[PDB]
Amino acid sequence: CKYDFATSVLFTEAELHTRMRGVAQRIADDYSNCNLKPLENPLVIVSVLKGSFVFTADMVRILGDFGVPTRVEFLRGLCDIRGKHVLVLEDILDTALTLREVVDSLKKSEPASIKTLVAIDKPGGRKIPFTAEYVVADVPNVFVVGYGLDYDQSYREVRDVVILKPSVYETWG
Amino acid sequence: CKYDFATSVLFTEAELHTRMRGVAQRIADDYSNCNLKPLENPLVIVSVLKGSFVFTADMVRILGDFGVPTRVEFLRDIRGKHVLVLEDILDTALTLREVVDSLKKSEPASIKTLVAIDKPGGRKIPFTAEYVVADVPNVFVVGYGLDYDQSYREVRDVVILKPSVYETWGKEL
Ligand SMILES: Nc1nc2c(ncn2CCCCCCP(=O)(O)O)c(=O)[nH]1
Ligand SMILES: Nc1nc2c(ncn2CCCCCCP(=O)(O)O)c(=O)[nH]1
Ligand SMILES: [Mg+2]
Ligand SMILES: [Mg+2]
């Protein structure tokens, strides 16, 4: 493997960006009827979990390439969402307990609409039923780091999503 | 100009990244005597101002390429840790002065600052960042995380905003 701390590389930065451009085209199509505009009517991006800064930085730039103007809020997102379209971003979706709570909280402010976009979905991890509208990639029952995802606050800066070696968290634990 | 809301492009994404690679080499050299390591001894990145998520996401990935492992904290467990405060824009220096002086109370091993856009003609107190990606004159810019009323952060380049944008939007408000 390319990294001494990883068993294998699951998604390279380039693979993640190819997938994100595919998702951005779908988002551009799906919101084309909304007359989004900078200042007057941006898509409100609500980024959830500290590590999602990486995904959110890349995704809002790709969305801008596809003609979807945004404004960003971080929950790690309350003022001025009534009547606005909201897209909630999260780097990983596993049990879905966080995103369920966030979406329900935001619904109380009566946005025009709310959808979710996740970089890594672990659908085997659910503790409640939950389907994200947009998913960049799926991961099975494996522990990954990279692309914002940490192990004890390290490895968020790895450009790829990789499986962390057991010998790393075993020694550190 | 490729942007109808801008009168000039000052720094492209590519130019910013070239300059960030130059800075990351200097950081790798300057911190070589700190034996930075993931988990045991990461460089602590303290990202200040909401819009700095873009710079921070790119910069921690570039630092990783140069052998400088990080952990990230956001403002808008550090005693004996090296702290590098990141901010997308340095202007009056009032924010960074306050943040640096606050962090010093927690007895970090060292503290330095790294800014993406320095506007040296904006100072209201004396302040020199240790690392600067690019200097901008006294003009109002957006892009690369920098906003006008929460819009245009997703523009990939740092551009001078067209006066008609804020003259007109100013009258909407
Ligand atoms: N970095 C990392 N974290 C993981 C992994 N599997 C589970 N986690 C905790 C996720 C914490 C955030 C909560 C997300 P929800 O509420 O469970 O959907 C994984 O593979 N990698
Ligand atoms: N978007 C944008 N905002 C600007 C610009 N110049 C000043 N600002 C306010 C700065 C906000 C953060 C505070 C930085 P400090 O405390 O003055 O050093 C500029 O050129 N563009
Ligand atoms: Mg955390
Ligand atoms: Mg703000």
Structure in words:
The PDB classes it as transferase. Keywords: inhibitor, complex, dimer, enzyme, transferase. The structure is a homodimer of 173-residue chains. Chain A contains 4 helices and 8 strands. Chain A has a 5-stranded parallel β-sheet, sandwiched between helices. A 3-stranded antiparallel β-sheet of chain A has the order 1-8-7. Chain A is globular, with a radius of gyration of 16 Å. The first copy, chain A, has helices at residues 13-30, 53-65, 97-107, 166-172; strands at 6-11, 43-48, 70-75, 85-93, 113-121, 134-138, 144-145, 161-164. With 173 residues, the first copy, chain A, is α/β, with parallel strands linked by helices. The first copy, chain A, has a single domain, classed as Rossmann fold, CATH 3.40.50.2020. Chains A and B meet through helix 2 and strand 3 of A and helix 2, strand 3 and helix 4 of B. The complex binds the ligand Nc1nc2c(ncn2CCCCCCP(=O)(O)O)c(=O)[nH]1 (2 copies) and magnesium ion (MG) (2 copies). One copy of the ligand Nc1nc2c(ncn2CCCCCCP(=O)(O)O)c(=O)[nH]1 binds at residues 49, 92-99, 122, 143-145, 149-150 of chain A. One copy of the ligand Nc1nc2c(ncn2CCCCCCP(=O)(O)O)c(=O)[nH]1 binds next to strand 4, helix 3 and strand 7 of chain B.
